[PDB]
Symmetry: C2
Subunit: 329 residues, 2 copies
């Protein structure tokens, strides 16, 4: 059995927050929502790891980039484009890029350009536009019993958190909003907002992790947002077998939501919110006329209901599995 | 008076042809229409030149990339994305990218990622989709007296060229089609197709250059294809003055057609088809409340009808000029 194709999703690397904590004076060194140098490094290192795996170990890809061998598609955000670029700088690093003349580098340090396409901002493929995303949550998630129950649990802290942070805290949605700022703050070694204990910060962050994961616990919600991408990735696998495509890899540069919605669509929803540079790979193997698939998330194989003791199933089985999911929704 | 903003268009670098000559056996070392190592180098070197100009000389941009300082938009093609990437590797070269921790590079060799967005394939902004482009030509160009006359002059050669090349040659459009292959062949030092004299090759290539330029000599045709981009670039200038935008540069990575259509829209159509890495800059200067614009093409200033002896006009004047063009079409 040989690996013949991979489809991959990443979450982008460390970024500045989207929001501000009203009562704190954090400065990030970059614009809101932009990838930080740390985030570039995280994706670059993931790239190096993917080289060791898919080039060195499996030999799916060669050491020097082959034009049209990898299709890369990113959501329409700076952080996801720059994350893809950074990852690709690890996958095909300086020293491997093309030469001209007599071993003279096309670009200094033999950098390797690899094209990245972006979706439009209004595309729903890699992430739902923000307002549409929130609309899905309002409709299917916020009034769910699990969400209401957890809200009731945490509600006695809202007043306190609101007065400490300044930001409105009137529901778990608001907790998630400030929780991201605290995650970024912690990742950059910034002090706690005055009057916010480490205990409080931990609780807010824990509620944020819980909330993000809980949103995609519903296969229905996951499918609404992630059905299209999940179908596309599986189609990519099929195109590697039916002669339609010569790509060795398709790579979708995305968000925590992207990973959550695909895993959730496949019926293996994540128990924790994807951290920076989290990644998922669909691996396609060929042994003669036999085609097998494995699903890898953050370095570990994932067992779909249709998989055997070896965390594997036939591509045919995967197709049947996906077909059933489509018919279901 | 200081430079405060630039909007730039490039043509991509050296590429493989789109088509092939039936009776030749050319192999290109890359896939059709893809950027070659030479093309990456051309764009990289343009990047270095732009650094010397807009960083070293004018100081519009700093030596180390500022997030959200440059907006880059490319057509939906590998060659234009890879060209932009390559150019940006010259503009902000290895050694200038971000650090983490104690002066340790975020990415090896201190590469600087700079985000590039792509239009959709069906966007008409940077280039018209192929069939739509040809439709414009068929309607406005092919039956024009200049095109017919040149066709009649060249026609006595069609039969010969057809039998030699194998490719259909029944009009100037076909000459332009094979002319591109011969341009690429010459750029890569490939031998002439058997039976095609250097004289014939030169004639075909000359007709190709002529034909591409002639297409955009009509301001009407130029406006159909280039009016939207031309308006956008001038709007970018206005946004640097009106507070709408904080970008120091907007950069549209495009094609010969992109350069041709903008120059043609502005009433200064090119006499020669843009070569690889050709480029156009709209420069905006500020001296107090006085705003002045200059137009640079391939390293030389271009005099719009509304400009003075110094190849300059007020932004107000450029706005009025563009407004009149809009009302004309």
């Amino acid at each position: 059995s040989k690996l013949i194709f991979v489809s991959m999703i990443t979450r982008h690397g460390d970024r500045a927050p989207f929001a501000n904590i009203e009562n704190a004076n954090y400065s990030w060194g970059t614009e809101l929502s932009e990838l930080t140098p740390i985030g570039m490094n995280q994706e670059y290192n993931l790239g190096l790891q993917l080289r060791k795996r898919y080039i060195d170990k499996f030999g799916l890809l060669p050491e020097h980039y082959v034009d049209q061998s990898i299709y890369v598609l990113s959501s329409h955000t700076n952080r996801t484009v720059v994350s893809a670029q950074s990852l690709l700088m690890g996958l095909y690093p300086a020293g491997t890029g093309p030469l001209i003349g007599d071993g003279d580098p096309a670009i200094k340090d033999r950098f390797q350009p690899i094209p990245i396409m972006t979706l439009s901002a209004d595309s729903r493929l890699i992430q739902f536009p923000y307002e549409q995303y929130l609309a899905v949550l309002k409709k299917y998630v916020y009034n769910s019993p699990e969400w209401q129950n957890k809200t009731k649990e945490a509600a006695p802290n809202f007043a306190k958190w609101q007065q400490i942070l300044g930001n409105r805290i009137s529901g778990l949605n608001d907790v998630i909003t400030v929780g991201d700022v605290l995650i970024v703050a912690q990742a950059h070694g910034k002090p706690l907002p005055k009057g916010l204990s480490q205990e409080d910060a931990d609780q807010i962050i824990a509620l944020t992790d819980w909330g993000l994961a809980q949103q995609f616990k519903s296969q229905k919600v996951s499918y609404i947002m992630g059905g299209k991408l999940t179908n596309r990735m599986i189609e990519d696998l099929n195109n590697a077998v039916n002669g339609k495509s010569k790509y060795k890899m398709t790579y979708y540069s995305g968000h925590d939501l992207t990973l959550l919605e695909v895993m959730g669509t496949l019926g293996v929803p994540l128990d924790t919110a994807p951290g920076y540079a989290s990644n998922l790979e669909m691996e396609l193997y060929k042994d003669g006329d036999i085609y097998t698939v494995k699903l890898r998330y953050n370095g570990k194989y994932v067992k779909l209901p249709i998989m055997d003791k070896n965390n594997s199933c036939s591509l045919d089985a995967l197709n049947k599995y996906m077909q059933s999911i489509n018919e279901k929704f």
